[PDB]
Amino acid sequence: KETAAAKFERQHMDSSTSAASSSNYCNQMMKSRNLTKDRCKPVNTFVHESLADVQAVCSQKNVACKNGQTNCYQSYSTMSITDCRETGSSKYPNCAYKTTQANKHIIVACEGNPYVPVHFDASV
């Protein structure tokens, strides 16, 4: 089984690009990160920052997770993000996504030793 930390990396980290360069970014990335394997993951955010910069959020602004738990942290600064969301028509196994690039704060749930991101809660 994948570790919670490795699963966060695979689903949320895109340190290789500064931003989504086309409308097809999400179709490509949802596929290459194995988020369309058995079903279409409806919503997924990729972060265009270093792994170190995203891990560092776990010692930034402590906030509530939307589930009401208290191991969530908001980034002090904005980050380059891409929101991926299934289109209204999308049907497995022809998953189709809308790509939205933005600069926003990220909120992540952190856990473990080392204390690292295990869930992407939201971007603000």
Q: Which one of 6, 23, 64, 76 is in contact with Cl ion (CB under 5 A)?
A: 6
By 3-state DSSP, what share of the chain in percent is helix, strand and coil, each rounded to 5?
20, 35, 45
User: Which one among 5, 51, 56, 102 touches Cl ion, defined by CB under 5 A?
Assistant: 5
Q: What is the dihedral of CA 82, 86, 91, 93, to 10 degrees?
A: 20
Residue 119: active-site member: yes
> Distance (Å, rounded) from C-alpha 109 to C-alpha 95?
27
Least Cβ distance, residue 83 to Cl ion (angstroms): 8
Is 39 annotated as ligand-binding? Answer: no
Which positions from 105 through 124 interact with Cl ion, judged by CB under 5 A?
Answer: 109, 120
Q: What is the DSSP letter of 24?
A: T
Residue 36 interacting with Cl ion (CB under 5 A) = no
User: Does residue 105 sit in helix, strand or coil?
Assistant: coil
Residue ranges that bind Cl ion, judged by CB under 5 A: 3, 5-6, 34, 44-45, 109, 120
Annotated binding site: 7, 10, 41-45, 66, 85
